[PDB]
């Protein structure tokens, strides 16, 4: 039982570590993008009517 549970936890850790490495840069640049994009889209939308 102990060996089997340890093997599964190790696999889970490996998977989480690989994801953290790639998600951290995207979350940090999110808020400036969303705000710049929304302002841009609203400005563009006012020229079509």
């Amino acid at each position: 039982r102990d060996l089997t549970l340890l093997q599964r936890e190790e696999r889970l850790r490996d998977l989480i570590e690989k994801q953290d490495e790639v998600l951290t840069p995207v979350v940090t640049s999110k808020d400036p993008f969303k705000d710049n994009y929304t302002t841009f889209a609203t400005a563009l939308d006012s020229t079509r009517h």
Binding site: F33, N36, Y37, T47
Partner: protein, 41 residues
């Protein structure tokens, strides 16, 4: 990042592409609308 950079520098090749599209779509809709009114009568 590339967008934010262009948004800060340029938004915040000739720039003519969007004018053509708009005029084309608006004019087409106008055509069809008038034809429909005539047909109803």
């Amino acid at each position: 990042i590339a967008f934010n950079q262009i948004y800060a520098n340029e938004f915040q090749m000739s720039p003519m592409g969007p004018f053509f599209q708009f005029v084309h779509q608006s004019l087409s809709t106008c055509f069809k609308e008038l034809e429909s009114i005539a047909q109803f009568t």
